[PDB]
Design a binder for this molecule. Structure first.
Ligand SMILES: [Zn+2]
Ligand SMILES: [Zn+2]
Ligand SMILES: [Zn+2]
Lengths: 675, 675, 675
C-alpha cells in the first residue's frame, strides 16, 4: 500500500484553511465528514506565513491546523511549502528569481519559479523542509510528504549558465568530446573554452519556443534543467528522510508535461503522484494513456491521483461544468489505471486571486446542499466501502507501448521534416487502437524490461539510445513482436544521425532500408493497399503526415502505397527474426488500419480483449494475487449493454452478481470482481 | 452652451499650420471660409517647437497663428502641447520615458507616452501650461483648452512602482488591510513590507496583455495608472485656471477605451470631448452607444466631438473611403446623442509621417474641388443655418443601461470562466435591442442617481461596489424595474468573492440563487423556453456563451432552459420587490429574445418608442426647454419611408413640414422640431 | 563567361569535408566523378577552425582540401569564412553581437548575425580575407571568391545607432535638412541635436515587424543598414582584390529578400550569385521572376545559381521530396533565365545540427545508389555534354517590369491604405501575365536604360525618384508604351508626398488625376467594364484590393468601374504621348484582364510570344551571337505537345531535329538551338 496505516483509496485533496479562520474550519470538518474525506494536503503555499525573514519561523498556526484535523482522524499529506518563495526573499535575494526564455529577469510574482541553481533558494528550501520534518517527526497522522509543488519551467539566468557548463564538463569530460557530440564544426561553432558556451533561448540559438539552430545544445539544456529541478527535489527529500525515514516522499507531476524527464524523476520518488487536468478536447483514451504513463514511471507501481477538479477548471478557454456522474466516472478511470488515491484541488474554494473560479468540494455558498457536493459525498461513500480491496492491484498487460522524453525533445526540436509530425499524437494513435478493443496495455520507458510482454510498440522511435537496439533484438529473437514506424532509428543520444541507412541500429531487426521520407501537405493523403487479405486487414486504407519510402531487404511486404511516385513500394512489412516478428509501418495510418493491425498482432501472440463492448465503454484490469478487477466505464451519455461473460463475478459497486448480458448506466462504472 | 461667445455647433478641427508656411495659411483661410469652418484646434503637437531646452520658450509662431485666425474670426481650441514630449527631453531626462509591459525601457518615439509619475514631465508640462494661459489670458478668441492629447497607456517604470506603493499606503493604510484585500495568503504572497510589492506586468504577475495570477494587484495597478494620468491632467487644468478661470478645460477621450476610468476623469473636466474612429465592422448602434456613454460621463451634459475623419482612416487594416453622405450621416449621429460640436482630424493632410494617408478637409491636391471638400462644405452650411437651435438640448430617457470601468477591468482579468465572455459585447446586446426600437436610453455609471429612470439594465454586473445594492434595492422598492444577468454580484471592489451564494448583495432584490455557471464551447447553445406566452415573448429562443444554473427563491419563473443537464431550470425570472420588479437573465440570449424582453419591460413601465421605423433607420431625441427634437438617421443605402406621427412638425434641415408617412433619402438625416 | 578558365555550366556546390575526415574525402571524390561534379564551394563556415584566438591562424586543413580537389581537377569557389564569427570572439568582444528589434543584446548563436558596425568584426574579417587571398593568390584552381554568406538582418546596437547619426550627417548635412526630410514638425519630433535621434525598433518608433510612426526614420534606417552590410562586403572584396586582382568576387544573395537593396549591392559585385529556395506554394512563374531579377541586377549579365537543394528542404513547414525529374526541371529553369552555374547546398548531408535533414547529393547512407543521386548524376552528364554552348547568352526581351527596394520599403512601412496591398504580389501579377504567354521579359531597376524596350511596366511605382519621370517621358515620347497603376507617383525618395494631385511627377505622362483611393475589404470586388471591345479585351472583368478614383485629363477611357459610388469613372485609360502611349490601371485586375491587356500591349508594339504552348509549359530564350536558344520546360505531371515552329532546329539535350509538332515529357526540358 502507499501507506499501511491508511488502508483504503485516500479521499480528499488540497486544503488551505490558512486562507480562512477557525470558524470556517469547523464547518470544513463537519462537511468533510459528510463527504467521506479522510486526507488533507496542507501547507503547500505558506512559506511566507512560516518564514517572514531569513531568521524567523512560526509554525504555531500550522500546529493548530494539524491538531484539528487529527481530532477528526483526517490524515495529512504534508507539503514543504517550497512551491512559492516569499516576496521578501525575491526582494532581498534576487538570485532566487528566474531569467526567462526571452532573456528577461523576472520580478516577484506567480509560483513554481525559483531558479533551481539558486544558492538562496536551495539554502532556505532545505532548512524549511528540515524544520518541518523535525517538528513533526513523531506525529502519527503524516502519511505522505509533498515536496514543493508541480516543478517545471526553465531558467536561463547566469547561475544556470555557469552550472550548465559544469554539467557539460561532467557529461563529456573534454571539449573534444563536447564539440563532437554537438557537431560544432557546423556554422563555425567550435568551442575552445567552456565559458564560450551559453544557454539556448531567444538571445542565442532558439526562437518561437521550439525552434533551434543547434539541436544538440537545446537537447542537453533540457536534460540539464530537468536534472537541476530534480536536484532541488532530492535535496528536500534527503533532508526529510533524515528526520522521518519511515514516511514516504512524493512530488506532484503533470502527466505528459513536456519539460521534465519524469522517467528519471520517478526513480527518485517513493511513489508517483500527479495532477490530472484535461482540456475540453482531450480524448478519454488520452487521459487513460496518461494515468497509464504515471503507472509506468515506476514499472507498474500504483500512483496517487494528487489533484483533479471536482467541478470546473479555471484556465481552459471554456471552463464547462462537469456533467452529472462525470466526476465519479473520471475518478474511477484513474483508479482503473493504477491510482490508489483520488484527491482534489481543492476542498474549499478560494476567494481569492486567479483560482477563485476553480471548482472545489465546498464552494462559495459555503454549504453541502449542492450538486457538486452531493456527487463528491457519493464517491466518498463508495470509496469508504471499497476499503482496501483494490489497493496494490497491478496490470498484467501483455502489450506495451513505449514513450520517451529525450526522444520527444529531439523530435520537437528537429527541423523538420514536418511540423505536422506530433510525437505524442502518433503515440496516442497506437494506444487508442488498443483502448478501443480493451486490450490491456502498459505505457513503458525505452529502458523497461521487455520479458513481461508479447507485443512492444514504439511509434516514431527517432532516438535510439545505447543498449536499446540490442534489447529489442533479444526480445524479438526470443519470440516477441516489435512494431516501429517512419522516422525511427534516425539518431543517437546526442541527436547525431546514425549513418549507413535508416533505421540504423534497427535496420537488421526491421529487415528494411528507408531511403528517403516524404512529408505531405495538410489534407493530402496516400493509401495503404493490402497485398492480400490478412486477418482483419482487407483492401485499402488511408495514411498521411509522412511517408517513408523503403526497400524490403529481409522483410515480407504486406501492403504498399497506392499513389504518388512511390506507388507500389512497401508501406507495411513483417520481418521474421529468430522466433519473433517485427512490423514496420512506413506512414501514419487511419484508425481503421490500426484497428486491424493491432487485432492481427494480438491474435498472432494469442492476446485477447479483456471484454467486447460498444464504442465508448472502456475496460481496464488490475490484478491482486489471483483476483481480477475489471473496470468497465461508460463514457457514453446513454445506458449501454455488453456481454460480461459467464463466469461468476460481482459488481463491487453494487454488490450484485453479474453474468452474461449486463447493462451499464450512462456515465456508469462497474468493478467486476472475478478470478 | 459650451461657450456663450460661440453660439452654434462648432465646425472645424485639428489644424497644424506650423507644418506648413504663411503662403499655405492664406489658402487655408480662404478654404475654411468656403467650408463654414469656424473653430481650429491648435498647438497639439509642438512642445519641441516652443521649447528647445530647459530654459528657452518661443511662442511667436503660435502668436501669428492665433492672430491670423482671429482676423478671420475663427475660434481657438488651444491645446497645451503636452501630448508628446521633445526629443531633447527624452535624451537628457530619461525619467520622462516609459518602461513597457515587457519591462523594457523605451527610447524616444511615438507620442502619448510620458511617464505620469516623471518629475521632469510634471515640472515642464506644468510650466508650459502656465506660460500659455498667462500669455493668452486676455485673448477673446480662445473658447476652450485642449489639455495634452488622448491620455492613455500604462507605465511600469521604477518611479511608478515607488508611487504605486504610496498610493497603496493611502488607500489601505496598513499591510494587514492590503494583505486581506489582495488575498495574499494564496500562493504565499504575504507582504511584510510595501517595498516587496511590484508592478504587475510580464516580469511578475501578468502575461499576454490580459492574463494575471493575482487580479487584485492588476486591478489596483490599473486604478493607480488611471489616477496617475488623471493627476497630470488636473495639474495642467489648475495651472490653466489660475490665469483663465472663465475658459473651459477639456481633454480628448476615446469612448470605450479600456485603460482609463473616464467616469472618474469626467468629474475633473468642464466638458467631455471625444475622438470617434469606428472599425470597419463597428456596428452603427455601437458608435451610438459610445456617443451615448460620452454624454453619460457627466450625467447628460452635452459633449464635443473633438475628432473624426472627414474621409479615410489610416490605422484600420482596410481604410475604405467613406461613401457619399456617410460623413454627414455620422456627424449628425454624434449630435443626436449630445455632441454640441463637430470637429475633424484634420483640416489639412500632413505630408508627412504615419498620418499622410489619413483624410483631411484639404487634401494633397491642395484645393476645394474635391468630393470630400464638397461634403464638408455642405455640412458646414447646415450647421451655420441651425444656429443655436439645438445647443444644450438634453436626453429625457426613462431607460438606463449601466457600464463601469472597474467592473470591466475585473472581468477581463478574471480566469475564466470563459474567454467568450466579452463585457462590452454583452452590454451592447442590451443597448442594440433598445436602439432597434428607438427607446430613448442613457448609458450610465453605477453611481448615477436612478430616480429619473423607470428601467435600469445592468448587464454582467460582476463587481458590486459599496452602496450599489442599497441604491438599487431602493430603486426597485419604490417602483422601478432592474435587470441584471448571469455572473453578476460575484465580487466587491477588491475583486474578492462575496460569499454565501450568488448574486450576493443582489440576492435579496433578484430573489434567486445562482448555484453554478456553465461555459459553453463556441457554437454551442441552449434554449430559452417560455412557460407561457408573455407579451412579445413566445415559444423558444436560443441562448449561449454562459448558462447560469439558478434556483427561484422569491422570484417567479417566466422561462426555463430547453436542454442539457439543467433543462427545465429557470433561465428568466421576475421578482416582485416592494412596488417594483427585478428580472434575472441567466444566459446570453439571441437578438429576438432581447427584442421581446425589452418591449415587455418598457410597456410594463409605460415607456414607448420615440417612433416606429424600418430597420437601419435610427431615431434619437434631444429636448430643449419643452421642445422635442427627433433626429432621424437612415443608415440604409436606399430610400426609406416611415410614419413620423400626426403632430405638426418641421424638418430643420429642409424647413419642410412633416406629418404622417414621410420618406428619407439614402444615408439621409432629418431633424424634426416638435413641442 | 563567369570565369574563362572554366568554360561550361559549373556543377557542384557547398562542400564541407572539415565536418568529416580524409577517408570520407576519398569517397567524396569517387562519387563526384560519378555525378560529374566539377566545382566545390569550400570554407563557408570555418572561421573558428582557422582562428582559435585573436592571434592564431591555421590553414593546413584547408591546404589539404584544396590540394586534393586539384588532383581531381575540381575547381574552387573559395569562401572567406566570415558568415559566422567564432564563439571566443562573441565571448571576448561582445561588440560583435547584435542588438535585436526587441532591443535585446544577443548572445553567441546562429550565423549571419555580426554587427556590421563592429570594430572587432571589421578588424578580423578584413585580416582573415586578406590572409586567405595572400596565401592562395597563385593557386590555379580558384575560380571565384565567395564573400561571407547570405548577409542580412538588422542591428539596433549602440554602435549602429552612433553610426546611423553619422550616415545622416553625410546624407542631409544639417539638422534643418533632416527635420524637413523627416517631416519632424509632426508629433513634436523636432531634433535639435544628432544625438537625440535613436534607431527605430520596438523601443521607439516601430512595432510588429512593419508598423511605424515615422516612415522617414524607418526608411533611412533600412538604407543605412543595407549600406552598412554592403560596406562589410566591400571591405573584404577590396582586401581580396589587393592580392588577386583578377579573380572574380561575389556573395550569395537571396532574390526577393526584402531587407537589402540588391540593386545597390550588385554594382559592387563582379557577378551576382543567389540561393533559390521556394516555398511549397511558390508559383513556378515566381521563381522564374526571381532568377530574372537576379539577371536584372547587373542589366542582363549572367549570374551564378549558388545554392538549391537537390532534394528536400529543412526549414519549410512541410518539407516534401522533390518528385522525379523536378530537380533537373528547376535547374534548367535557372539556366533559361540566366544562370551560368548550377550549384547545390550541399554535396554531403551534415550529421549534424539544424541542417541534417536538408538534402544533399550524398546523403546519410553514404553511397550513390539512391534516387536523388541518380538524378544528380544524370544532370551532371548533360552539363558536361552541353559544354560552353550556352555560356554568355543573353535576354533580348522587349518587355520590362520594374522593381525597387526603396519603393518596397516605403510601401511596406506605410499606414495604410491597405494591408491587402502586397507590392511583390502586384509586381508578380504583371510578370505572370507575360510568363503565361511566353513573352520574353526582363525584371529591371527603375534606373535601367529604357531604350532597349518597347513595353515598360511599373506596377505600384509609389515612390518616384529623381530623374525617373523625365526618363519615362522620353521613353514614351520616343515610341514606348508605359504602364503604371493605382497608388503610384505618390511620394519622393524621402517618403514625402508630392503635392498637387496624384500621380504627381507622373501626372503629365499618364494624363490622369487620381482624386482618391478606396481600400476594399477582403473578398470584396469591383468590375472593370470595357467601353468597347478592344483586342483581346471584351466585356467585363473583376478587380480588387484598391480602387483609384480618377479623372481623365488628356487620356482616353478604355474601361470604367461597374459598381459602387465611383461606377462609370475610368479604371483603364490610354494616353497618347509623342509616338508612344501610357496606360494607367486604376485597380488590381484579375488574371484574365491582365492576359488580355498584356496581349493587347505586345501586339500594339510588334512583340510576339516566343512560342505558343499549353498551360504550365514555360518558354524562355537566351541569345548568343546569331543563335537563339529556347528553353522549353514542362511543369506538368503529364506529357505535352506543342508547335515548335517550322525553322530547322535541334534539341541540345537529345541531339534530335525538332520541327512542327513536338511532344515534351512530363517535367521535361528541351533546349532548342535555332537562328
Ligand atoms: Zn537559473
Ligand atoms: Zn512610470
Ligand atoms: Zn550594430
Amino acid at each position: 500500500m502507499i501507506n499501511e496505516k491508511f488502508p483504503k483509496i485516500w479521499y480528499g485533496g488540497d486544503y488551505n484553511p490558512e486562507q480562512w479562520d477557525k470558524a470556517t474550519m469547523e464547518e470544513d470538518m463537519r462537511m468533510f465528514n459528510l463527504a467521506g474525506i479522510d486526507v488533507a494536503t496542507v501547507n503547500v503555499f505558506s512559506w511566507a506565513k512560516i518564514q517572514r525573514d531569513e531568521v524567523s519561523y512560526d509554525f504555531t498556526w500550522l500546529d493548530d491546523i494539524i491538531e484539528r484535523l487529527t481530532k477528526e482522524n483526517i490524515y495529512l499529506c504534508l507539503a514543504t511549502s517550497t512551491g512559492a518563495h516569499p516576496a521578501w526573499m525575491a526582494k532581498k535575494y534576487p538570485d532566487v528569481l528566474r531569467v526567462d526564455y526571452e532573456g528577461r529577469k523576472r520580478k516577484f510574482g506567480g509560483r513554481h519559479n525559483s531558479c533551481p541553481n539558486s544558492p538562496t533558494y536551495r539554502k532556505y528550501a532545505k532548512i524549511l523542509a528540515g524544520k518541518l520534518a523535525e517538528r513533526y517527526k513523531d506525529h502519527p497522522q503524516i502519511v505522505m510528504w509533498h515536496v514543493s509543488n508541480e516543478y517545471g519551467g526553465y531558467c536561463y539566468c547566469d547561475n544556470c549558465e555557469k552550472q550548465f557548463r559544469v554539467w557539460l564538463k561532467e557529461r563529456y569530460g573534454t571539449l573534444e568530446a563536447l564539440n563532437k557530440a554537438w557537431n560544432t564544426s557546423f556554422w563555425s561553432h567550435t568551442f575552445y573554452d567552456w565559458d564560450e558556451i551559453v544557454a539556448p533561448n531567444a538571445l542565442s540559438e532558439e526562437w518561437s519556443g521550439n525552434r533551434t539552430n543547434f539541436q544538440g545544445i537545446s537537447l542537453d539544456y533540457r536534460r540539464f534543467q530537468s536534472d537541476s529541478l530534480l536536484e532541488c527535489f532530492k535535496m528536500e527529500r534527503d533532508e526529510l528522510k533524515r528526520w522521518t525515514p519511515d514516511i514516504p516522499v512524493t512530488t506532484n507531476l503533470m502527466g505528459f508535461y513536456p519539460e521534465l524527464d519524469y522517467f528519471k524523476w520517478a526513480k527518485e520518488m517513493d511513489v508517483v503522484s500527479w495532477d490530472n487536468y484535461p482540456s475540453m478536447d482531450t480524448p478519454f483514451s488520452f487521459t487513460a494513456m496518461a494515468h497509464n504513463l504515471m503507472r509506468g514511471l515506476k514499472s507498474g507501481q500504483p500512483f496517487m491521483l494528487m489533484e483533479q477538479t471536482p467541478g470546473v477548471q479555471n484556465w481552459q478557454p471554456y471552463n464547462s461544468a462537469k456533467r452529472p456522474g462525470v466526476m465519479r466516472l473520471w475518478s474511477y478511470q484513474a483508479v482503473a489505471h493504477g491510482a490508489d488515491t483520488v484527491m482534489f484541488f481543492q476542498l474549499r474554494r478560494s476567494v481569492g486571486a486567479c483560482e477563485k473560479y476553480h471548482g472545489a468540494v465546498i464552494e462559495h455558498v459555503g454549504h453541502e446542499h449542492t450538486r457538486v457536493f452531493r456527487e463528491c459525498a457519493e464517491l466518498g461513500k463508495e470509496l469508504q466501502q471499497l476499503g482496501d480491496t483494490i489497493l496494490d492491484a497491478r496490470s498484467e498487460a501483455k502489450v506495451a507501448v513505449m514513450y520517451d522524453w529525450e526522444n520527444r525533445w529531439a523530435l520537437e526540436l528537429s527541423s523538420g521534416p514536418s511540423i505536422a509530425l506530433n510525437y505524442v499524437n502518433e503515440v496516442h494513435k497506437y494506444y487508442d487502437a488498443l483502448y478501443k478493443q480493451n486490450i490491456q496495455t502498459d505505457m513503458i520507458s525505452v529502458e523497461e524490461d521487455l520479458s513481461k510482454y508479447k507485443v512492444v510498440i514504439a511509434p516514431v522511435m527517432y532516438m535510439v539510445k545505447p543498449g536499446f537496439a540490442e534489447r529489442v533484438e533479444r526480445f524479438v529473437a526470443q519470440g516477441g513482436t516489435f512494431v516501429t514506424t517512419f522516422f525511427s532509428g534516425i539518431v543517437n543520444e546526442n541527436d547525431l544521425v546514425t549513418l549507413g541507412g535508416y533505421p540504423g541500429e534497427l535496420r537488421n531487426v526491421m529487415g528494411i532500408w528507408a531511403e528517403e521520407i516524404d512529408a505531405l501537405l495538410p489534407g493530402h493523403q496516400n493509401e495503404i493497399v493490402l497485398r492480400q487479405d490478412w486477418g482483419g486487414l482487407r483492401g485499402s486504407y488511408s495514411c498521411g503526415i509522412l511517408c517513408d519510402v523503403i526497400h524490403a531487404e529481409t522483410a515480407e511486404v504486406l501492403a504498399e502505397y497506392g499513389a504518388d511516385y512511390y506507388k507500389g513500394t512497401p508501406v507495411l512489412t513483417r520481418n521474421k527474426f529468430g522466433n519473433g516478428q517485427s512490423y514496420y509501418v512506413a506512414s501514419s495510418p487511419d484508425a481503421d488500419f490500426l484497428q486491424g493491425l493491432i487485432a492481427n498482432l494480438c491474435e498472432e501472440q494469442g492476446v485477447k480483449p479483456l471484454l467486447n463492448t460498444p464504442d465508448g465503454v472502456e475496460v481496464a484490469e488490475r490484478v491482486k494475487n489471483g483476483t481480477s478487477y475489471l473496470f468497465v466505464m461508460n463514457h457514453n451519455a446513454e445506458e449501454m449493454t455488453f456481454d460480461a461473460g459467464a463466469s461468476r463475478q460481482r459488481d463491487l459497486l453494487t454488490g450484485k452478481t453479474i453474468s452474461g448480458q449486463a447493462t451499464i448506466p450512462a456515465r456508469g462504472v462497474m468493478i467486476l470482481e472475478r478470478a
